[PDB]
Assembly symmetry: D2
Homo-oligomer: 493 residues x 4
């Protein structure tokens, strides 16, 4: 932290906020202030957007060869790997998740940049067989333009990489703003990108409250695409604001992801994966398997096994090797999780285990919340329908394959889910009917740069990762040339 920048990065320069305001960043493990950064203004955000537009129109990045753009994106990928240790530590300090989880993030981030580096020069568009004689028809794919990018606090650098990599690869200019409470890795990646070298204005980092600078990032006339990952309420607000300029939006908003366990699942595998689904990063994951659906014939056996394991989950400091689950991100977020416990009980569900702050001494100063299992609930309940985004799972039974599908689809969301069954034919039937962007068969949480990620229904609009993710950052232009032009002579001479 001694050498980490504390400033925004606008138009090739590290700069303070226009009003000199600052914000203290906290470690959720002990609620101690660990760093202080600039808290930018809406005029700073506007200046970044105007700089991105100017850089885009200069052509220095947008007209660079795709091959060269790919080489630069690859150079970022290499810096991530080179600084893997320090990045992982920063991420754990800022977000609370285990160091091992943070190492896995850094390995993935390297692969994300590498994937897009390699995709950069592989399209360009299509030649069309024109239906009009004596014409040439082609579709050229250009960078979409100036893009704003807003990320959440759970996986700051990972989510940032999903946006930055395709934007740079395609030739866009970008303005990024990480969550105000978790900016450290994002500042660091900007330092690394500056070392690679990009024309002035091509990349910009704004630091600040979503409520202060967010609307300018979603509502400015010079933006061609707003790409946001976070919660549903902010997402909807952002889309409404983007509508003022008919601006493209790419949204990923979390989910109510079903984890469907059939009676012919590998039982110990399913228990393992129900734990993974529920409690990695204290359930603060877009992909969290918060809604367990278990076949009735094994429901009691399953609940007992799960509960017994949940009691053994090891809570602690993300830097300690024995820690299995760290704290949740903030006081506000822990309070929200606590109020959901009251909701669940008032609706008549059972808090089978957990449901409170742990009492242990070394956990007292941190934002800890016990891994929790909620039983005796049904699809009509708020605790089942709503994304708690904490270390909490619900358990519902189902009788038949048809019922599992109906229940799993009975939410406003559609991001991801899993089916556990040794009968692969059955798992595939079920997968084909789930209205989800990603379905895992005998697995959980698996995602990678090669394949698109995103939501049906209220889980989002568009995709990130894969060729489809890159396509958000492109725009099609049909250039039609009449090679033997003739007068139409419709209007009198």
């Amino acid at each position: 932290l001694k050498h980490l920048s504390q400033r925004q990065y606008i138009d090739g320069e590290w700069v303070e906020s226009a009003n000199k305001n600052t914000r203290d960043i906290i470690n959720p493990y002990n609620q101690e202030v660990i760093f202080t950064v600039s808290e930018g203004t809406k005029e700073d955000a506007e200046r970044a957007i105007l700089a991105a537009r100017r850089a885009f129109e200069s052509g220095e990045w947008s007209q660079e060869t795709a091959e060269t753009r790919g080489k630069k994106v690859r150079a970022i990928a290499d810096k991530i790997k080179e600084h893997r240790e320090a990045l992982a530590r920063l991420e754990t300090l800022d977000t609370g998740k285990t160091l091992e989880e943070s190492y896995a993030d850094m390995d993935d981030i390297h692969n994300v940049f590498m994937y897009f580096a390699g995709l950069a020069d592989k399209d360009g568009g299509e030649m069309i067989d024109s239906p009009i004689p004596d014409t040439e028809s082609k579709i050229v794919k250009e960078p979409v333009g100036v893009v704003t990018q807003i990320t959440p606090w759970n996986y700051p650098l990972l989510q940032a990489s999903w946006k930055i990599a395709p934007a740079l690869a395609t030739g866009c200019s970008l303005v990024m703003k990480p969550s105000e409470i978790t900016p450290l890795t994002t500042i660091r990646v900007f330092e690394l990108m500056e070392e690679v070298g990009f024309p002035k204005g091509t990349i910009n980092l704004i630091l600040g409250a979503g409520s202060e600078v967010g609307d300018v990032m979603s509502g400015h006339k010079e933006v061609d695409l707003v790409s946001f990952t976070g919660g549903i309420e902010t997402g909807k607000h952002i889309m409404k604001n983007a509508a003022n300029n008919v601006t493209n939006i790419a949204l990923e908003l979390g989910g109510k992801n079903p984890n469907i366990i059939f009676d012919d699942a590998d039982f110990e595998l399913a228990v393992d994966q129900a734990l993974n689904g529920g409690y990695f990063h204290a359930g603060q994951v877009c992909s969290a398997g918060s809604r367990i659906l278990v076949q009735n014939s094994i429901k009691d056996k399953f609940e007992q096994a799960l509960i017994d394991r949940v009691k053994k989950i090891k809570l602690g400091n993300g830097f300690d090797a024995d820690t299995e689950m760290g704290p949740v991100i903030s006081t506000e977020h822990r309070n929200k999780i606590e109020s959901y416990m009251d909701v669940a009980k008032a609706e008549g569900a059972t808090i089978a285990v957990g449901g409170k702050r742990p009492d242990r001494d070394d956990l007292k100063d941190g934002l800890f919340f016990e891994p929790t299992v909620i039983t005796n609930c049904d699809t009509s309940m708020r605790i089942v329908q709503e994304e708690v985004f904490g270390p909490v799972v619900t358990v519902e039974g189902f009788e038949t394959e048809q019922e599992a599908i109906q229940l799993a689809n009975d939410s406003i969301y559609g991001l991801a889910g899993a089916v556990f069954s040794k009968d692969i034919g059955k798992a595939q039937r079920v997968a084909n009917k789930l209205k989800l962007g990603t379905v895992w068969i005998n697995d959980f949480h698996m995602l990678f740069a090669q394949a698109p990620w995103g939501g049906y229904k209220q889980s989002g609009i568009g995709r990130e990762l894969g060729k489809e993710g890159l396509e958000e950052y492109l725009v099609s232009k049909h250039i039609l040339t009449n090679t033997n032009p003739q007068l139409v002579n419709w209007f009198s001479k």
Copy 2:
């Protein structure tokens, strides 16, 4: 005139496999803009009718009867629609001309295009179910399956009713979606007729639905209902924005096409007479009521005076009249409200200091007195700061601005909130290509105007829209990607203590 067509035309909405009146029995009189006479009367539906249609589309979608039909068979049905369009080409063209005022010849060209749109998408239906991914994780299979997006609402404008409908209906049916369509309340005739033809082909109950009525009565239901997966709208910018904001309530995908301020760039080395011809075509086809209209002429200074004179002299000869008469070159505008809007723009142009060089009023001639006619108009001595240059008038009106250099042409052409289409005229093809590469437009024509077709995507940069219609990209609006990842050798992670 047009008579016999209407004798057997349905007057009702089509919901869940039945032709039905409005829930409140309300009706609306449809007008011919040539003479402002009532030509037909149709049901004016309610918001509950729209909701019932949406719920019927959802039920049909979940039944799987269309959404799980083979893509090959779906293509065959979309092809059968295409064949019915061609079979009824004459009656459809006549209806369209009766309802919208444009010339019969223009309507025939629409019907040919509509046939080709359905045929294109019929052929595309079974050509792409997704991808196999080379997974980075050993012992996994990764595949991307493309499914129909789901239930789609489709809202069309009054200028090219059936054409715009076909751009939405064809890919929706080809992919296996269920749909609810609502044409403009003032021009529903061809859309009713195409629903009759689709019914003849045969689609499961609830797969297709037609709502008739005011956007202000049923529009919000169509854009804001939780059971909709995609709202596809073609029309004006204000309504588009409102629709997008409403769709946000359910994070619903939107596909918008909203018109433009399309530049027609004429260099001093253009084929002069060609450029004059195409400036006229750009400006005045369908009385300029076209998303692709070339309303903003940018002409190189060295030939600007010559160009203005030639264009003005031609504009005075444009033949106004009944769309059914063979000599007619330009029909009336669509409604009293729209003519009034065009008129108020003339006042704006003069107040900001532009010159109405020719036209700018209603014609006096006797056979035109009863119709919604407005003279083809040329506005000169204007600049990019003016409202008359920046805003879409959507009437038989063009502005003319000069430019000195290639760079200036590009800067001016890009200086608008829009980005739908434009043209470059020059015999120096290398130059036209440079310019085309720099225009922020979804479509650029080199030595042509108004050319569009099913094979290529159409849509706007900036405020001209979101997404694309036509082409493979158009079909993709009606698809959704699902990543199915199978772990073929699953192992416990053993992260959490046992």
Copy 3:
């Protein structure tokens, strides 16, 4: 009655013409060995004239520069004619080739779908725009029709195989010269009549009738040919490829196979028996996709052999026009003799002819080219009867112990066209499918193929593909057009 109005001539450069030497050939019905029709037997000069006419038409641009959309519409019109004449075409095919009328109806439905598929694909490409690594350049790849193509088909599924070649050729804008098997030209003549009704520029389509040994070499070895597409046997295929090499001409070959039908002990047993029968005996095993090599898990091998043999004895032989017929005759005297000589080979190597292996004695079968459905047991991979394509109503049965051994045995042939895996354990069937060196692998099915997916062989089963986008791509050629938009002198060489 069909035959009363059917043309007897070749179709060259827009005209129905006799052979240059007036020679003819009698066409036979294999059910009764009776002459049913007589057609021209063309010369090598006729073939050359067709090729030169195809070249001329191609260079005129009338088809090759027609819009892709309009080409598609014409291919679609052919598809509709096939359906319209479905009954007569099916009857002709059954008369000429001997297979059951029901099989022929299924062919005609498929043929309609092939033409329709390619009609729909015609205008869906054109090529790519490339993001060039050189500043101030535009790089595009335009896909053009390959050019003049020669097309040679076999006698088992004449029209079906013809459609696989004609449809993409016309869709892409090529000119073509087609020659069906000399012994089965009826439906191919008919389809040329139908194409003439649709209307194509003169020289775009040509039909040569005659012996492969008389006109074949011209079709494969002429300098004006850009692609030779052949479906048939391995020996002719190799000969063709060697001849095509004289002009470095592209080749697309599909040469049959030794297709494994792998049955695990956890297969749905009755399904596997049913499909082993389908695999072995449809069209008297005269199918590129025939499942002639059964590999059955040792644990169920005796059970399987007994059940298969008992069913094989009930197979109903007869006239393809009779509804109760399950298997018709084989195609010719020469082919039946070849099948017979294989029986001698199998016995000399020590295999057992468990059932069949001879001509049936029954009276109504005496005059036709019948051969009994046959099962050969007690054999192994070293045997000629196992390694070689018999292309008759004959299957061999070998046992395997493990999954690994099934794969090893199945892949132990020179061929690589198609095969199946039968197992209720889908995971296992998929593992096996990934390791088989075959262009098509069926999991719990057999003989399934369709226009939407490419068909072709690894190893000695062929080169290239037919059907699907890949099938169309055989009839395209890529051209990279690179424009320097700001050309500068290099000034390497002294001024």
Copy 4:
């Protein structure tokens, strides 16, 4: 020279550097002075067979063929980085072995780095397609797998460049390969094998055979365990290879040179056209598959063009590829120079004019090398052997044409179809012409431009298939349709 002290002299088979089975060797020559510079193993047909069988064994093991596509990409990228790291030494080796200028060799090495990088990036970007099946209750997918065992044979003009075009996609897709460079120019290929060994590939995945095409070539093209033969060279050897591959119905990818037209209209930028006619004709002494050996010039400017070209041809600086002022080095071998010389006799006997050059240069410092003067042949026509046949030397012919139509007819009037250019300031016209030339690559107002992002290959007798681009990678893939019936039912056709 110091380069050579540590360079391997052996073949690389099944993970080991090995000598020829019979200890035979071959002396490698520098064409600048005809001196022996190195001695390598001259392998036997049994060595080639052993390599092929090792490639097959490796392929079946799955260690490379089932490695993740992402990881295969990373390895191909590591090869790319080694090429750039060793750019200087590789360029010098290439110049020493082939005679071309050091500057040309540097450009090759830059291009080779980009080829490996391109294919590294493409490795994990496909996998196949999901098909919407026309049969209910079925799942249809096309999986793209490595084609299998591939044999790769390269020529002497751009040894490492041509090698990279084959190696990169083969490794990216998961194939096993056996490569054999031209017997007279093996140095950079040996070196690249050393570099690949440093990256690390499973045993048998890569193999290098060294030797005479006439001794080991037939095994490489005719062995039953080969799935693809990829050959770049001359037409006669290509045809022989294709005939041999036919014995096992083996896929072939051939690129065989051309008779590439350089079409110059009277509205071309004249000085640009002269510059590019020189580049087209004389880079690497015309020993280029892309050489613009057939100039077609509009009649109206033909005399002006000839005079301007001839005057420049006289100024071309011949010399040692290592000297900075050298513009054109020697041709590759005695046999090749003799072939070029016999073509001069042919041209004269047919009545063409040798307008300039047409002989060995007399100058002292050129006396010991395999030099041949840059040559312009005029007063010829399309019926002549000198016009129809690929000389592959520093020689161009010049023919006139009257109209656009005639330019096209003449340019297409050859057995070949690899590449060509159109020079005209009228871009509309250049595009019309380009659309009608039967060529795999057409340059508008440029020459010799090719790159990994776009496919390269020939119409007609210039080849079969493509190298470079996605289409190049596709030569190293094979499609398998896996069709699963998810609700199987008995057909019940045959009696029970």
